């Protein structure tokens, strides 16, 4: 049973899954847009949105918070100095997911894009 449980397992153990989200965040915040499988995508939204919201606080504490997942001062500088201001007046939802039309040839996996909002 799975009654009222939140969070996909994604056939990864506790730390692989952590690293999975973190690495995707590094990639999302870097290129502004990535392609993944639909399930990874939907789960990535929250993980990244939180990081953006903290960059919206902007304080030392928040930066050090974000660095725990992002681990790259430059990347976080880009987060605070270029990305975060774009959302000053936006109330959550700094990410969107749209599903692509074609599946991966090799395993038939459904694909989607995750991008940062305008």
Partner RNA sequence: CGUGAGGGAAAGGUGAAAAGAACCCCGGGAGGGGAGUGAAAUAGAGCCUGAAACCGUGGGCUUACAAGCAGUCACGGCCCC
Partner RNA sequence: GAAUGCCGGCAUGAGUAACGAUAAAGAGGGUGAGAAUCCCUCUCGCCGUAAGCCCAAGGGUUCCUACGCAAUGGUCGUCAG
Partner RNA sequence: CGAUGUCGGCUCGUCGCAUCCUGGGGCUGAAGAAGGUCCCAAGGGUUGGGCUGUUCGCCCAUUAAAGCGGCACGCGAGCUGGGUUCAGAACGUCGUGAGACAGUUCGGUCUCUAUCCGCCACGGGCGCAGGAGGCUUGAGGGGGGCUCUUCCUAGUACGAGAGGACCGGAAGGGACGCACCUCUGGUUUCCCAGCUGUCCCUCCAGGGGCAUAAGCUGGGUAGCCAUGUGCGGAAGGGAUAACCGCUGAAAGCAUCUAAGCGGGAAGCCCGCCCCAAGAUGAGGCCUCCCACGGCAGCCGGUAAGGACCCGGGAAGACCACCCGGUGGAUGGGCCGGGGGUGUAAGCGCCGCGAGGCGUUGAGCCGACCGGUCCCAAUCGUCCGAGGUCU
Q: Please give the residue ranges that form the binding site for RNA (CB under 7 A).
A: 1-7, 12-20, 22-24, 26-27, 31, 34-38, 40, 42, 45-46, 49-50, 53, 60-62, 64-65, 67-68, 71-73, 90-99, 104-107, 109, 117
Q: How far, in Å, CA of 70 to CA of 117, rounded?
A: 19
Interaction pattern, residues 62-101, with another protein; x per rule: CB under 8 A: ------------------------------------xxxx
Tell me the residue ranges of DSSP E strands in the chain.
33-37, 95-103, 110-116
Tokens of 62: 């928040």
Q: Quick one: which of 5, 15, 68, 102 contacts another protein (CB under 8 A)?
A: 102
- Phi and psi of 90, rounded to 5°? -90, 135
116 forms part of the interface with another protein (CB under 8 A): no
Partner whose binding site includes residue 62, from another protein, Mg ion, RNA, none (CB under 5 to 8 Å by kind): RNA
Task: Report which of 85, 92, 90, 75 is spatially closest to residue 31, judged by C-alpha positions.
Answer: 75
Residue 71 Cβ, how far from another protein at the closest point, in Å?
30
> Do 70 and 48 touch, CB atoms closer than 8 A?
no
- Phi and psi of 85, rounded to 5°? -65, -30
Residues at the interface with another protein (CB under 8 A): 1, 3, 98-102, 113
């Amino acid at each position: 049973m799975r009654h009222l449980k939140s969070g996909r397992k994604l056939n990864r153990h506790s730390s692989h899954r952590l690293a999975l989200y973190r690495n995707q965040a590094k990639s999302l915040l870097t290129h502004g847009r990535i392609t993944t499988t639909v399930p990874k995508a939907k789960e990535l939204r929250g993980f990244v949105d939180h990081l953006i919201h903290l960059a919206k606080r902007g304080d030392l504490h928040a930066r050090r918070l974000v660095l725990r997942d992002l681990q790259d001062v430059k990347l976080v500088r880009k987060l605070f100095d270029e990305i975060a201001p774009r959302y000053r007046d936006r109330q959550g939802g700094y990410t969107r997911v749209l599903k692509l039309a074609e599946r991966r040839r090799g395993d038939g996996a459904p694909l989607a894009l995750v991008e940062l909002v305008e």
